[PDB]
Amino acid sequence: FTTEIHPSCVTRQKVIGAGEFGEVYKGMLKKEVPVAIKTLKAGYTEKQRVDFLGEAGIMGQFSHHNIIRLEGVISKYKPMMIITEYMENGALDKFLREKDGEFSVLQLVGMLRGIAAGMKYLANMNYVHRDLAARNILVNSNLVCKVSDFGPIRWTAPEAISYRKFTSASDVWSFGIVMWEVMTYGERPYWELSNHEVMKAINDGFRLPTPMDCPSAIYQLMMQCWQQERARRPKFADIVSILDKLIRAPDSLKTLADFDPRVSIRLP
Ligand SMILES: Cc1cccc(Cl)c1NC(=O)c1cnc(Nc2cc(N3CCOCC3)cc(S(C)(=O)=O)c2)s1
């Protein structure tokens, strides 16, 4: 089951997202606690209802630090609502772009370990995410990153593009892209390349280059996430283990991969 919340306990305060089938609000739940609130407004279809309550059902089956926590649902009254913990810093991709250069390498790798721990939990629960990307991670005031969006060519593994094979191993590919997004403070993967140019480049063997100021071990790990052969990629358990060891021995992050500069500045 899922906890049913009475609408008198829910106060919507500000719109923070979505729209056209409902909105996402910041609000308070009854001292009161901050929550996020997603609505499903009148006229919703049967498929929208099973998708809406399905997301709440899927989230209600999970209990992990790096997975968005469900507070409850409003299903007996209209509009229906999903109420979750409130993540004060919003989506990770936008967050990183607005905080460019403001974190330590150790902080950035800690964000990746949390995302990986969430993904290990999901994969072991037999949940394939299919849309892992910094835009679908949320960040709270403890800098904890949590996977969201339960129920994008340049985040997607080749086998998922080519023949629709989505597995935890294609989520691992996506996690490698997320690593690159985090270490670059939200750079767009493959910059201005078109979707067709990205697929072509990947098939030809090209991979995203090293971010600036990126630990050698971190670049090596994202490169292994991008193995063409699915069976050669690390499992999330391997990823979590490696990230944990690097954080525990933080001097290991001071060895940087060489950064290939695109622009030559020479001063006499
Ligand atoms: C309510 C809900 C229902 C189903 C699934 C989920 Cl994952 C949720 N919960 C959420 O969507 C959210 C929980 N916390 C959130 N914090 C949040 C907070 C913000 N901001 C807070 C700081 O000021 C900038 C905007 C922005 C976003 S968003 C929509 O642009 O990614 C999100 S959203």
Domains, the chain, with CATH or none: 1-87 (3.30.200.20), 88-268 (1.10.510.10)
Method used to obtain the model: X-ray
- CB–CB of 118/226 below 8 Å? no
Q: Is 91 in the pocket of ligand 1 (CB under 6 A)?
A: yes
Q: Is 16 in the pocket of ligand 1 (CB under 6 A)?
A: yes
Q: Is 57 in the pocket of ligand 1 (CB under 6 A)?
A: no
Residue ranges of the binding site for ATP: 16-24, 38
Task: Output the CA 38–ligand 1 centroid distance in Å.
Answer: 9
* Closest C-alpha residue for ligand 1 atom 18: 90
What's this structure's resolution in Å? 1.7
Task: Name the residue of 16, 39, 132 to mutate for ligand 1: max ligand atoms within 8 A of Cβ.
Answer: 16
Catalytic positions, please? Answer: 131
Q: Which atom of ligand 1 is nearest to the CA of 38?
A: 1
R_g of the chain, CA atoms, integer Å: 20
